[PDB]
Symmetry: C5
Subunit: 208 residues, 5 copies
């Protein structure tokens, strides 16, 4: 409960509990079900766009959530949440398939763990992508698709699902017309199991 | 006295909880935040991006860290890896902060902790009017990333806006003002506090 | 067992087992033979091509597999596979001889270990290479050759065996792929008496949007 | 003594002793007198200068020495010195106030520790600075001043004191050095009551004809 | 020879090496300096600037030395193993006229031989301040790289040129440049800073742009 959120000893104790129970390297599967991972992108900026090379430089708030019930505690008279370094926690091994640079994480690498076992990690990230830039200077604009999925965990182990101008910079050379998100389950010739992904389509165009 | 310093550092490391907000008994950690500009380096009026260097003055209190200094040092420098530090982020930065200075804080015997790095960073802010007399006005917002208003409060602190500013920049500081906000986002039920730092500057004619 | 894949305690236990057994700095040689390392590149993208300096910037999916049977376990009623951080495992010390930048690994550094002892690591990597770019703007295209082999382990310790398509190749690349061929070599250099194996990957590619009459 | 410098077990024993005594995070203050740190810069190169932005990219040899007598040992029959990773040692928290990039350390991060307790750390560094570039094409040259001081230790705790000019300077630089002068400041800022010492290095340089 | 692929033997040799290795102590033997051999074979010349006298090169840095305390009996065990360099002492070498950090392109493993010889041979990309003048002339330019121990003087570490193979044996046929020749020489030099001499190896290569 909220009147206890600032009891420091309580938070320290919860962090200790979390660190004893957490298995940073094991998927927190429950009920012989895949871990349900939620993923949405809220765009913060569009910095560089190249219509010749089909490359973009974007900043986005990647909202990522899932649950590990082994981490839950009774919060009747203790903090409902604490911030935890992600190195103490399991995080889904998500990758953006068409990213062409490493993600540059702009924000402190702390997640929130909620007393019901929900884990929230929502970093702001700048990253470069290979996507369809054609039309960026037209009224229809461009539609750049970013596919994000678990790299090493197939659909039996991890499912992914969705969790834009509210946080989009008014100062960008560009403007968002629409962001849509859909989910796919796809199998490659490499592997017999399917890998789920969230595909985020960013329709945008140069201002004016 | 070195041994006295070694002992204070030991005490600090015994008591310090680097991953726990130091809020006690019941009040959100009061964090003081102030920017003193050092330099303005790259200004792109087309892409609306700036590249700046600022002294980020950050102070707060952890009274569990306090000690009686009647016959021992008043302060020691401590590596920030040994201390809790607020998880501040500049929302409109478009690059990671480049910390130019040694990552050491001062801990004072009354529990005050001061961290004040010099930081070069790239921002997305209004650069329109930089070449005019009124100047541009670049707004930088800084607040706690994962801690809302019940856990951390963020506040302004104040001399001359150009005291530490480089005479060799192509730019000059007309005015710096800092304002506090508390904003709830559609994502979450709690408010997060921030300092909006308004830097009014123009090219030197 | 496929049903038992999501038994969490089971996964945790296999991981513990693997870490007890794994020797991350020791080649997993079995029956007095070299570790057979399989290597295959699937190109994902060609980003920058400089016809003058003969350089390319490519993203490729480097599929590496090998066997360490000491890692095997009975999966009759347990997960068939688990993901393991590469820092917990031996990984072949592969190097691209003509690369001119460090490999930029774009994906999480986890391998899959299979209950029969097969270990799979398949990172996506962006890297720059010194290669023949000549002809990239013609029908026949350019052919850029990339060599990958073990850096410190010779043929008695590690063997590399290699195993179009544009299945994973971006349709948004300025370039398109005509053919990919992969040859195995065992070469002896004057520095050293023992040979080193490599796979030589021949990427035949050309610009889309070439001048056409 | 020098005749025992290469006794390996002796060196390993000295290293062990140093690591037992060393407090990497505690200033080695003696008799409560501020640790005296010498700082000298010998310029290696000037790589790129920008008259419009007043920025300079330089490479310099940053000669830093101080003492920690707790590290001393009797070298009558053992090595007079050994090299030690700086991570095992206290190093002064020096910062260059007008640097606009992180210092790029070109050399192995080892210090020398002498048996009298002297510690020497002299890295080669490439760094960008904001400084007066004007006059670079004249004969009077330009004068770019670099200030270096302890970041968190004021004058009661650390004092800095400046320790030919082109001896290590690259003959292949587009530029040449007319003069280097090194002076000591002790400055109080509005932020804080205590003074912070610095060494101000004035580099007078110009483009070659 | 027959015993190289005995994995338990290899693990035991690694254990032995790690037990006796002193990664931070020079492996001096019988009160004499560690003899470090260093040689560069060039892989590539990437970017050249005649105005600024800067050069971007890839080279194979062949570095060898001896640590006899690591030696073992290889009669019925492997003759060599690979070892992460973090487990071993490696000479603190620096390129004096390097103007950027060395970008190591290869895995950071050395070989240790049963007779105690250690071989580390990274492929490195690095940028240098050197004489670029004459690069597009038939005579070419001559860029000189000096490499020596940074903190160990001549009583502790000697550096020696190695050994010939063709100068272009590993050089990219696709570079815009071609190597005319490479020479190496040892120097031993005293600086105003220090009483002792520091040894270095000076690599001079005359290279030119293809025409
Ligand atoms: C561009 C951003 C958009 C979101 N926004 C936020 C979000 C957050 C936030 C809240 C919760 C999390 C959680 F840890 F739960 F994942 C992360 C960030 N914090 C702050 N101070 N500002 C303002 C600037
Ligand atoms: C570049 C494309 C992206 C989609 N696709 C894959 C491959 C894989 C993948 C990665 C690694 C393995 C491993 F090595 F661990 F077995 C298996 C599948 N995972 C996902 N989510 N997508 C094929 C390559
Ligand atoms: C540009 C390179 C130079 C030689 N060459 C080598 C050298 C080496 C090699 C041999 C021995 C070592 C040692 F560990 F001993 F130092 C390192 C690399 N390994 C491979 N696979 N290829 C291929 C092309
Ligand atoms: C650009 C440099 C200037 C001095 N010089 C040096 C200095 C040093 C040196 C001496 C002592 C230290 C010490 F550890 F004491 F600090 C550091 C470097 N070593 C070598 N090999 N060369 C040659 C070229
Ligand atoms: C950038 C300007 C010029 C240098 N100057 C300072 C500030 C500081 C300083 C003082 C106190 C702290 C503290 F630890 F308290 F946070 C940090 C830096 N130190 C030095 N040597 N010079 C004022 C800021
Ligand atoms: C601190 O210690 C000193 C001497 O030990 C004593 O004067 C003092 O009362 C203590 N602190 C206070 C004033 O509370
Ligand atoms: C592996 O162990 C299981 C135990 O359930 C048992 O079936 C058998 O001993 C092994 N598997 C096979 C081949 O039956
Ligand atoms: C140092 O050691 C020498 C050699 O035994 C000895 O003669 C001398 O007394 C020692 N010096 C001191 C004061 O420790
Ligand atoms: C090493 O091998 C034999 C083992 O039969 C051992 O007894 C002896 O010490 C060594 N002999 C040599 C030098 O090969």
């Amino acid at each position: 409960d909220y009147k206890d959120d600032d009891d420091k000893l309580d938070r320290a104790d919860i962090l200790y509990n979390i660190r004893q129970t957490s298995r940073p390297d094991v998927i927190p599967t429950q009920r012989d079900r895949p871990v349900a991972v939620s993923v949405s992108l809220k765009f913060i900026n569009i910095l560089e766009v190249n219509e010749i090379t089909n490359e973009v430089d974007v900043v986005f708030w990647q909202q990522t959530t899932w649950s590990d019930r082994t981490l839950a505690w009774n919060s009747s008279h203790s903090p409902d949440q604490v911030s935890v370094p992600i190195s103490s926690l399991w995080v889904p091994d998500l990758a953006a398939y068409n990213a062409i640079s490493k993600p540059e994480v702009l924000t402190p690498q702390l997640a929130r763990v909620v007393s019901d076992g929900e884990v929230l990690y929502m970093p702001s990230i700048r990253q470069r992508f290979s996507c369809d830039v054609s039309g960026v200077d037209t009224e229809s604009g461009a539609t750049c698709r970013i596919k994000i999925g678990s790299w090493t965990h197939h659909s039996r182990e991890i499912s992914v699902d969705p969790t834009d101008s509210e946080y989009f910079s008014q100062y960008s050379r560009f403007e968002i017309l629409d962001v849509t998100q859909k989910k796919n389950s796809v199998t490659y010739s490499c592997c017999p199991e399917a890998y789920e992904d969230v595909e985020v389509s960013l329709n945008f165009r140069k201002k004016g």
